[PDB]
Design an enzyme around this catalytic site. Structure first.
Site: not given
Ligand code: 33A
Length: 333
Positions: A25, A27-28, A142
């Site tokens: 794609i 956080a922590q 936060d």
């Molecule tokens: O950019 C995103 N999705 C598009 C994408 C990119 C690559 C492959 C498939 C979809 C995207 C999804 C998320 C996400 N969706 N559900 C949970 C998250 C998430 C991402 C990072 C950290 C947390 Cl705690 C939660 C954050 N950014």
């Protein structure tokens, strides 16, 4: 065996076999998108390695764990599944969080040339999710665009539950050690609302000194009634600064920034500026609260009386090894 490993970038994801073709794609932790054959929906999988080996981090990971299940709301991210590939406490190591997959996070959205429809609608959902957190006893403190993710239909979700380094969106009473009530989250919503507008961080301090300076540089020195409310030593640090009168909100956010095409846009711009002037207030006593924010003419066209008005739903310190077992127990449901 019910798991299998895939490598994604620097990371190796060992997950239950139900999650298929993982791809990359916050956080922590580290995060992958994946398909879930069991639920038949795409998910996100966050990896948490040795979450117990940083005291501050362990407490927060335990909290985000029990709360993220305790809470349920359309604008908060909820835990679809949690699991560990390790089979004993001694070898316990990684926790994997499964959430529903979103399409972007807020920093990515902020960069668009956004209109008031989209913009207010996101803010509605933020306030809406904040309100909920509050009715559960959770006061975030936060909030930042990075911990907010939205779908391509603009549906929005807050990813975490905040406090018990980016200091940009922290409320004054937080960075200054004052008590706080609910609307301490209102500050944050406004640093974000103002950031969709300038497209830039409002109070981008190099550190905690320059933080306050970016703030009273634009809003002006708080009134004595506020300063009276600081601890004796905090006053002097905050007093000694250069005294500012601040800028009018038409100056901090000139018409140049909003799409003041015609009447609707013009009116909507000033309303936005009005909300900003009620949210971006230094003194919690003069700052708007979540409800009146929801009822603001910039926001209230989104107000769904049921979606909002509805049925309302600790803290110790530990050794690393007691965190590890505490966190382990939790993952073992
Ligand atoms: O950019 C995103 N999705 C598009 C994408 C990119 C690559 C492959 C498939 C979809 C995207 C999804 C998320 C996400 N969706 N559900 C949970 C998250 C998430 C991402 C990072 C950290 C947390 Cl705690 C939660 C954050 N950014």
């Amino acid at each position: 065996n019910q798991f299998y490993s895939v490598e994604v970038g620097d990371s190796t994801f060992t997950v239950l076999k139900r999650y298929q073709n993982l791809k990359p794609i916050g956080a922590q932790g580290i995060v992958c998108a994946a398909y879930d054959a069991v639920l038949d929906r795409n998910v996100a999988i966050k990896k948490l390695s040795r979450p117990f080996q940083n005291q501050t981090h362990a407490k927060r990971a335990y909290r985000e764990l029990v709360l993220m299940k305790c809470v349920n709301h359309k604008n908060i991210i909820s835990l679809l599944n949690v699991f560990t590939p390790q089979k004993t406490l001694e070898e316990f190591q990684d926790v994997y969080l499964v959430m529903e997959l979103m399409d972007a996070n807020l920093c990515q959205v902020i960069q668009m040339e956004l209109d008031h429809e989209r913009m207010s609608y996101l803010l509605y959902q933020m306030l809406c999710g904040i309100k909920h957190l509050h009715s559960a006893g959770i006061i975030h403190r936060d909030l930042k665009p990075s911990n907010i993710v939205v779908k391509s239909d603009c549906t929005l979700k807050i990813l975490d539950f905040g406090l018990a380094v980016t200091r940009y969106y922290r409320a004054p009473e937080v960075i200054l050690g004052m008590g706080y009530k609910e609307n301490v989250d209102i500050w944050s919503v406004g640093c974000i609302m103002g950031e969709m507008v300038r497209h830039k961080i409002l109070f981008p301090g190099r550190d905690y000194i320059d933080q306050w300076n970016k703030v009273i540089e634009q809003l002006g020195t708080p009134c004595p009634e506020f300063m009276k409310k600081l601890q004796p030593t905090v006053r002097n640090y905050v007093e000694n600064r250069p005294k500012y009168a601040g800028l009018t909100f038409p100056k901090l956010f000139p018409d140049s920034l909003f799409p003041a095409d015609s009447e609707h846009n013009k009116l909507k711009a000033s309303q936005a500026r009005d909300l900003l002037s009620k949210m971006l207030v230094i003194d919690p006593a003069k700052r708007i609260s979540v409800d009146d924010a929801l009822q603001h003419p910039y926001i209230n066209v989104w107000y769904d009386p049921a979606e909002v008005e509805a049925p309302p739903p600790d803290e110790r310190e530990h050794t690393i090894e007691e965190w590890k077992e505490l966190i382990y127990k939790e993952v073992m449901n």
